[PDB]
Design an enzyme around this catalytic site. Structure first.
Site, mmCIF file in Angstrom:
data_model
loop_
_atom_site.group_PDB
_atom_site.id
_atom_site.type_symbol
_atom_site.label_atom_id
_atom_site.label_comp_id
_atom_site.label_asym_id
_atom_site.label_seq_id
_atom_site.Cartn_x
_atom_site.Cartn_y
_atom_site.Cartn_z
ATOM 1 C CB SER A 16 16.328 -10.470 -23.240
ATOM 2 O OG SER A 16 15.992 -9.120 -22.609
ATOM 3 C CG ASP A 50 10.069 -10.839 -18.436
ATOM 4 O OD1 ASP A 50 10.765 -9.730 -18.263
ATOM 5 O OD2 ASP A 50 10.459 -11.558 -19.383
ATOM 6 C CG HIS A 74 14.285 -11.057 -18.508
ATOM 7 N ND1 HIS A 74 13.056 -11.117 -19.501
ATOM 8 C CD2 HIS A 74 14.967 -10.638 -19.162
ATOM 9 C CE1 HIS A 74 13.934 -10.619 -20.489
ATOM 10 N NE2 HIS A 74 15.021 -10.360 -20.300
HETATM 11 O O1 LIG Z 1 18.457 -8.127 -23.387
HETATM 12 C C1 LIG Z 1 18.391 -7.881 -22.250
HETATM 13 C C2 LIG Z 1 17.690 -6.409 -22.165
HETATM 14 C C3 LIG Z 1 16.442 -6.239 -22.695
HETATM 15 C C4 LIG Z 1 15.868 -4.937 -22.684
HETATM 16 C C5 LIG Z 1 16.181 -3.967 -21.746
HETATM 17 N N1 LIG Z 1 15.798 -2.612 -21.550
HETATM 18 C C6 LIG Z 1 16.616 -2.275 -20.709
HETATM 19 C C7 LIG Z 1 16.620 -0.881 -20.182
HETATM 20 C C8 LIG Z 1 17.867 -0.424 -19.388
HETATM 21 N N2 LIG Z 1 17.746 0.771 -18.679
HETATM 22 C C9 LIG Z 1 16.660 1.667 -19.093
HETATM 23 C C10 LIG Z 1 15.627 1.082 -19.786
HETATM 24 C C11 LIG Z 1 15.708 -0.151 -20.195
HETATM 25 C C12 LIG Z 1 14.154 -0.305 -21.096
HETATM 26 C C13 LIG Z 1 14.257 -0.029 -22.858
HETATM 27 C C14 LIG Z 1 12.988 -0.638 -23.622
HETATM 28 C C15 LIG Z 1 13.382 0.490 -24.328
HETATM 29 C C16 LIG Z 1 14.093 1.152 -23.290
HETATM 30 C C17 LIG Z 1 13.282 -1.340 -20.462
HETATM 31 C C18 LIG Z 1 12.819 0.269 -20.463
HETATM 32 O O2 LIG Z 1 17.806 -3.074 -20.485
HETATM 33 C C19 LIG Z 1 17.486 -4.146 -21.202
HETATM 34 C C20 LIG Z 1 18.140 -5.230 -21.090
HETATM 35 N N3 LIG Z 1 18.749 -8.458 -20.992
HETATM 36 C C21 LIG Z 1 19.358 -9.724 -21.199
HETATM 37 C C22 LIG Z 1 20.504 -9.742 -20.442
HETATM 38 N N4 LIG Z 1 20.244 -9.448 -18.870
HETATM 39 C C23 LIG Z 1 20.182 -10.200 -18.119
HETATM 40 N N5 LIG Z 1 20.800 -11.444 -17.989
HETATM 41 C C24 LIG Z 1 20.592 -11.948 -16.660
HETATM 42 N N6 LIG Z 1 21.008 -13.159 -16.244
HETATM 43 C C25 LIG Z 1 20.651 -13.333 -14.962
HETATM 44 CL CL1 LIG Z 1 20.834 -14.839 -14.099
HETATM 45 C C26 LIG Z 1 20.168 -12.128 -13.837
HETATM 46 C C27 LIG Z 1 20.035 -10.876 -14.377
HETATM 47 C C28 LIG Z 1 20.199 -10.816 -15.984
HETATM 48 O O3 LIG Z 1 19.918 -9.726 -16.670
HETATM 49 C C29 LIG Z 1 19.593 -7.954 -18.861
HETATM 50 C C30 LIG Z 1 18.353 -8.010 -19.702
#
Ligand SMILES: O=C(c1ccc2nc(-c3cnccc3C3(C4CCC4)CC3)oc2c1)N1CCN(c2nc3nc(Cl)ccc3o2)CC1
Length: 290
Positions: free
Chosen positions: A117, A234, A264
């Protein structure tokens, strides 16, 4: 009085590294009993922390790699205002410091990167900064192209913060349930006190936008070998990004595996997906450390 983690544990009691801004990063190591065949750094994503990689790290250690990681600034047990970063390159700089420190301590070993991610975008930009130096990169659903709808909506908020002085503006939280089909893993994620599940500060989301822009500019110059694992369903890192990475990277050793219907968080997905993910990383790293 001793410097403590945000959870009040003295850094003197924990493995750590001080970064170029004088901030303590919490570190983790998993080393085999024998001589290591290679080093591999594990790069976690936004809001999470290195402890989420325990099982993957132990699998890699079982292949006689020396696995290492740290919590990025503003995450987990490292210092920094939560989910703030002065510029996205801070994360890359800090990975490079830790890699360079480990290669001094364990010289002559090839070094791999594994990132998921946001951590996958960090891995891409780290390899791109040092063309020719990393032996390989394992990418689990890397941030290459954000979900177009979520990105457009966010860019509205970003317009406010970039044109005005709004230091506390935040996005709404992401629904953790749309990121893995494995309900038990979702519940664990929602229970972990080291995870930031609050809505993203707009300033941080701007740095993620910077990450996407920088990844795009880096792809046509990327040459490191890589394995790319991507779920077709995803909702965060759009699968179009994985296809664009396969198309635009110049790497002579690039492999894409698509998990049909998977969400994802592929290494915390349904058992048949996660077991395959572990097996495929095992095979790919084993073949490149033989
Ligand atoms: O590294 C990220 C990650 C990547 C990219 C992102 N983008 C936004 C975001 C948040 N707010 C408004 C807007 C955005 C955008 C960004 C892109 C430029 C603006 C997508 C529009 O958040 C993010 C987070 N993650 C890894 C850990 N994570 C997780 N691990 C999990 N394990 C389980 Cl078992 C269930 C669930 C889980 O979730 C969460 C995901």
């Amino acid at each position: 009085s001793p410097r403590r983690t945000p959870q009040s544990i003295p850094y003197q009691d924990l493995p750590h590294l001080v970064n170029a801004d004088g901030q303590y990063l919490f570190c983790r190591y998993w080393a085999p009993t024998g001589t290591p065949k290679a080093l591999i750094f594990v790069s976690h994503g936004a809001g999470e922390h290195s402890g989420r990689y325990e099982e993957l790290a132990r699998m890699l250690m079982g292949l006689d790699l020396l696995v290492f990681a740290h919590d990025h600034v503003g995450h987990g047990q490292s210092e920094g205002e939560r989910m703030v970063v002065s510029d996205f390159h801070v994360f890359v700089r800090d990975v490079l410091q830790h890699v360079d420190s480990m290669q001094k301590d364990y010289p002559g070993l090839p070094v791999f990167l594994l990132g998921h991610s946001m951590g996958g975008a960090i891995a891409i930009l780290t390899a791109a900064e040092r063309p020719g130096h990393f032996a390989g990169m394992v990418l689990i659903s890397p941030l290459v192209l954000a979900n177009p709808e979520s990105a457009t909506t966010f860019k509205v908020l970003a317009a406010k913060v970039l044109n005005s002085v709004l230091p506390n503006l935040s996005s709404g939280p992401i629904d953790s349930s749309v990121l893995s089909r494995n309900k038990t893993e979702v519940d664990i994620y929602n229970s972990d006190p080291l995870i930031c599940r609050a809505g993203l500060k707009v300033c941080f989301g701007i740095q993620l936008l910077n990450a996407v822009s920088r990844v795009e500019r880096a792809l046509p110059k990327l040459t490191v070998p890589f394995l790319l694992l991507q779920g077709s369903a995803d909702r965060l890192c759009d699968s179009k990004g994985a296809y664009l990475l396969m198309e635009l990277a110049k790497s002579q050793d690039k492999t894409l595996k698509i998990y049909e219907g998977a969400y994802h968080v592929l290494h915390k997905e349904l058992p048949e997906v996660t077991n395959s993910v572990f097996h495929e990383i095992n095979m790919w790293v084993s073949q490149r450390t033989a």
